[PDB]
C-alpha cells in the first residue's frame, strides 16, 4: 500500500516534515517514490509555512493511495477555496 | 622607476693553497611595474657590495614584456637548464600565487595576478631566467595581428 506521509527531518526540537509518497513497509525517513511538498510546524506567521503540490496528489490518491492522519489535515489546511 | 628587490643571497667557496676564501653571490630583479624586467646576478667578497654589483647589472640587462592590463596574455612555458616553469594569465581578481624567486620577478614586472608553478629544479638563478625566457617569448594580440597581416578583431573575436 502506497501512502502519503511525513518524513521528519530537521534538528533536535526543531522539526521539519517532508511530506512524501512512500510504501507502507518502507521506513519513515527511508525509501520513497517521490516527495510532494513539505510542512513546517515551527514556521509561524511569515513568508513561508506549508506547501503541498496538489497535482501529484491526484496521480496517487486517484489511483489508490491512503493519506496519513496529519497529511489529511494539511489538505484541509491548504483548502480548495480558502 | 626602481621597484628593485633581492631574491637570494648565497655564499660560495674557492679553495687555495692556504685554506678557502668565501665570496657571496646575490640575485636581484628590477622592474618599472609596467612590462619591464631585468635580473642581475652579481658576486663579491662582501655581502652588501655583491647586491650593488648585482643591482647595476639588473638595470642594464632589461627585457620588455607586452602584458594585458595587469596580467599575462596567454599560458606560457619557459624552460631553462633544470627549471620548467609554467604560468597562466588568470582573471582580474586574485593575486600573484607563485613561488619565491618566481614571484619577485613577476611582481616587479607589473603582473598583479597570475597562476604559476615551477616544475623540475627550483634553483633561484635558473627559475628567474626561466620566467624571463617565458615573459620575453610571451607575444601579444597586437604583435600576432601584424605578424600574419590579417586583422586585430578577426583574430581576437
Amino acid at each position: 500500500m502506497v501512502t502519503i506521509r511525513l518524513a521528519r527531518h530537521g534538528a533536535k526540537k526543531r522539526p521539519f516534515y517532508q511530506v512524501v509518497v512512500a510504501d507502507s513497509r518502507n521506513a519513515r525517513n527511508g525509501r520513497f517514490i517521490e516527495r510532494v511538498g513539505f510542512f513546517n510546524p515551527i514556521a509561524s506567521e511569515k513568508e513561508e509555512g506549508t506547501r503541498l503540490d496538489l497535482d501529484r496528489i491526484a496521480h496517487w490518491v486517484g489511483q489508490g493511495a491512503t493519506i496519513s492522519d496529519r497529511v489529511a489535515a494539511l489538505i484541509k489546511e491548504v483548502n480548495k477555496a480558502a | 622607476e626602481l621597484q628593485e628587490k633581492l631574491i637570494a643571497v648565497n655564499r660560495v667557496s674557492k679553495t687555495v693553497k692556504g685554506g678557502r676564501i668565501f665570496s657571496f653571490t646575490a640575485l636581484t630583479v628590477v622592474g618599472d611595474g609596467n612590462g619591464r624586467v631585468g635580473f642581475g646576478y652579481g658576486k663579491a667578497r662582501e655581502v652588501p657590495a655583491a647586491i650593488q654589483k648585482a643591482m647595476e647589472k639588473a638595470r642594464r640587462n632589461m627585457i620588455n614584456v607586452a602584458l594585458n592590463n595587469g596580467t599575462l596574455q596567454h599560458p606560457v612555458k619557459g624552460v631553462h637548464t633544470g627549471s620548467r616553469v609554467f604560468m597562466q594569465p588568470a582573471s582580474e581578481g586574485t593575486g600573484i600565487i607563485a613561488g619565491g624567486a618566481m614571484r619577485a620577478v613577476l611582481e616587479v614586472a607589473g603582473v598583479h595576478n597570475v597562476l604559476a608553478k615551477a616544475y623540475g629544479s627550483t634553483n633561484p638563478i635558473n627559475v628567474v631566467r626561466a620566467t624571463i625566457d617565458g615573459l620575453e617569448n610571451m607575444n601579444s594580440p597586437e604583435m600576432v595581428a601584424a605578424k600574419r597581416g590579417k586583422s586585430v578583431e578577426e583574430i581576437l573575436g
Binding site: - | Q73, H74, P75, P89, N139, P141, V144, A146, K147, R148, G149, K150, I155, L156
Partner: protein, 129 residues
C-alpha cells in the same frame, strides 16, 4: 616507416622555418591541401601550389615577418598512435585564442574558431601558435 604523413608535413614546416627556408616541397594529398589551405587562409603560410599530375608535389611558401619566423610552434595532437576527438564545448583554444587548432569536422576541415560558431566538434589535428 611513414605512418603519419600529416605530422611529417608539420615537421617540414617547423624545420623549414628554423632553417630560414623560402619554400617546402612534399608529397601531396587530400588532407594535406585541406590543412595547408587553412594555414594560408588565416595567414601562417604565404601562398601554395599543387604542381604534378601523376606524382603530385605540394610545395608551400613560408612567411617571415621580422628575422623571426611566423609559425612560432606547431605540433601534432591527434597522432595515429592516439586519436583525439573533442566535443563542441570541449574544443581547445591555443594560446588563449590567438593561435589556432586545426580541427577535422564533419563539414570539412576548419579552424577551432569556425567550429564553435558552426556548432560542431571533431578530430583536432594540430595546434598552431
Amino acid at each position: 616507416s611513414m605512418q603519419d604523413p600529416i605530422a611529417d608535413m608539420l615537421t617540414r614546416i617547423r624545420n623549414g622555418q628554423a632553417a630560414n627556408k623560402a619554400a617546402v616541397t612534399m608529397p601531396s594529398s587530400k588532407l594535406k591541401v585541406a590543412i595547408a589551405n587553412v594555414l594560408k587562409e588565416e595567414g601562417f603560410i604565404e601562398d601554395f601550389k599543387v604542381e604534378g599530375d601523376t606524382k603530385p608535389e605540394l610545395e608551400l611558401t613560408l612567411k617571415y615577418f621580422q628575422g623571426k619566423a611566423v609559425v612560432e610552434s606547431i605540433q601534432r595532437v591527434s597522432r595515429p598512435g592516439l586519436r583525439i576527438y573533442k566535443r563542441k564545448d570541449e574544443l581547445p583554444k591555443v594560446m588563449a585564442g590567438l593561435g589556432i587548432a586545426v580541427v577535422s569536422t564533419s563539414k570539412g576541415v576548419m579552424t577551432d574558431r569556425a567550429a564553435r560558431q558552426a556548432g560542431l566538434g571533431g578530430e583536432i589535428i594540430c595546434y598552431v601558435a
